[PDB]
Write an enzyme that holds these catalytic residues in place. Structure first.
Site, mmCIF file in Angstrom:
data_model
loop_
_atom_site.group_PDB
_atom_site.id
_atom_site.type_symbol
_atom_site.label_atom_id
_atom_site.label_comp_id
_atom_site.label_asym_id
_atom_site.label_seq_id
_atom_site.Cartn_x
_atom_site.Cartn_y
_atom_site.Cartn_z
ATOM 1 N N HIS A 61 -33.979 28.104 -8.541
ATOM 2 C CA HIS A 61 -33.577 27.972 -9.988
ATOM 3 C C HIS A 61 -33.964 26.573 -10.478
ATOM 4 C CE1 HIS A 61 -30.678 30.642 -7.876
ATOM 5 N NE2 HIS A 61 -31.262 31.485 -8.720
ATOM 6 N N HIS A 91 -30.129 17.259 -10.313
ATOM 7 C CA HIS A 91 -31.203 18.226 -10.582
ATOM 8 C C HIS A 91 -31.553 18.116 -12.002
ATOM 9 C CE1 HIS A 91 -27.480 20.287 -11.547
ATOM 10 N NE2 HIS A 91 -28.194 20.822 -12.527
ATOM 11 N N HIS A 93 -33.028 20.463 -15.704
ATOM 12 C CA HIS A 93 -33.349 21.725 -16.373
ATOM 13 C C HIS A 93 -34.494 21.343 -17.323
ATOM 14 C CE1 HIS A 93 -29.423 23.656 -15.225
ATOM 15 N NE2 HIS A 93 -29.026 22.391 -15.160
ATOM 16 N N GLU A 103 -30.352 21.451 -22.076
ATOM 17 C CA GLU A 103 -29.258 22.436 -22.226
ATOM 18 C C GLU A 103 -28.368 21.943 -23.360
ATOM 19 O OE1 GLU A 103 -27.927 22.979 -18.115
ATOM 20 O OE2 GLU A 103 -29.034 24.887 -18.349
ATOM 21 N N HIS A 116 -29.000 16.271 -14.546
ATOM 22 C CA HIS A 116 -27.571 16.419 -14.220
ATOM 23 C C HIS A 116 -27.313 15.779 -12.925
ATOM 24 C CE1 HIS A 116 -27.248 20.233 -16.947
ATOM 25 N NE2 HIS A 116 -27.278 19.094 -17.622
ATOM 26 N N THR A 195 -23.612 24.942 -15.800
ATOM 27 C CA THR A 195 -24.444 25.726 -16.730
ATOM 28 C C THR A 195 -25.256 26.778 -16.005
ATOM 29 O OG1 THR A 195 -26.295 24.206 -16.429
ATOM 30 C CG2 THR A 195 -24.712 23.696 -18.190
ATOM 31 N N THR A 196 -25.042 26.922 -14.680
ATOM 32 C CA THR A 196 -25.652 28.044 -13.924
ATOM 33 C C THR A 196 -24.543 28.848 -13.298
ATOM 34 O OG1 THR A 196 -25.891 26.332 -12.246
ATOM 35 C CG2 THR A 196 -27.864 26.995 -13.391
#
Ligand SMILES: Cc1cccn(O)c1=S
Ligand SMILES: [Zn+2]
Length: 257
Positions: A61, A91, A93, A103, A116, A195-196
């Site tokens: 992901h 990590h 996004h 996000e 993040h 958020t995942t």
């Protein structure tokens, strides 16, 4: 299982993770005119001098850069937090195009990516127990805009070839996350969630107002990663972001005027 495609993306998550439609989901749009200055907030304390990175992993992901969190080595405290939160991983996004990928948004503005830095409250003993608590995590969110290169990012970009596909990892020691921070630690803060999936509602979000600049070539390299495993058809790791969710009964506070 869940992902970011048409058939398993954010609009589908609620069927396996009903908390997707919960009362304190993330990300959200940050309406800068509506976020009130809170003069009782403290300056954020980011103590990363003793950080021990270990490894970088493509989990299908995103990629995680992992830290040794078995002692108080890299901690976040102050700001809106009570107590001490230990860095476990960071990590990003990011988008398929520079105009999307973050996000959180700021007055509906999307940045090219969002970092993040994930920390767990040491009163709970470990990450697993911390994610069962409403104050178990603190995530420092940092936006990325495309412009000048970020030198402190380059060691991460250079290792990505070695973890192209899902399940690959590589040794990633002696990386200093201080080189990913902007100058200012002014921030917005609100209670939210991962958020995942599993979208757990454990997170004090601290979102920095100042983005960092990364180069076009740096973000281009993120977008060469793959969601698939080796030997499967190539699906580029892009657009691994969840859109903004309803704010509901929440106030976003500003640490600055
Ligand atoms: C806090 C966190 C943990 C694991 C994954 N993601 O995306 C997040 S934002
Ligand atoms: Zn994240």
């Amino acid at each position: 299982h869940w992902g970011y495609g048409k058939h398993n993306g954010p609009e589908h998550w609620h069927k396996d993770f009903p908390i997707a439609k919960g009362e304190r989901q993330s990300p959200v749009d940050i309406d800068t005119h509506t976020a009130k200055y809170d003069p009782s907030l403290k300056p954020l304390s980011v103590s990363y001098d003793q950080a021990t990175s270990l490894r970088i992993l493509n989990n299908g992901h995103a990629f995680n850069v992992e830290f040794d969190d078995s002692q108080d080595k890299a901690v976040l405290k102050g700001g809106p937090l009570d107590g001490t939160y230990r860095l476990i991983q960071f990590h990003f996004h990011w988008g398929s195009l520079d105009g999307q990928g973050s996000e959180h948004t700021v007055d509906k503005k999307k940045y090219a990516a969002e970092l993040h830095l994930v920390h767990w409250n040491t009163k709970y003993g470990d990450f697993g127990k911390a994610v069962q608590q409403p104050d178990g995590l603190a995530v420092l969110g940092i936006f990325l805009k495309v412009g000048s290169a970020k030198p402190g990012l380059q060691k991460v970009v250079d290792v990505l070839d070695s973890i192209k596909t899902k399940g690959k990892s590589a040794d990633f020691t002696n990386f200093d996350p201080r080189g990913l921070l902007p100058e200012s630690l002014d921030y917005w803060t609100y209670p939210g969630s991962l958020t995942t999936p599993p979208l757990l509602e454990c997170v004090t979000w601290i979102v920095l107002k100042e983005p960092i600049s990364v180069s076009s070539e740096q973000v281009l390299k993120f977008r060469k990663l793959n969601f698939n495993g080796e030997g499967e058809p190539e699906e580029l790791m892009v657009d691994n972001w969840r859109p903004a969710q309803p704010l509901k009964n929440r106030q976003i506070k500003a640490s600055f005027k």
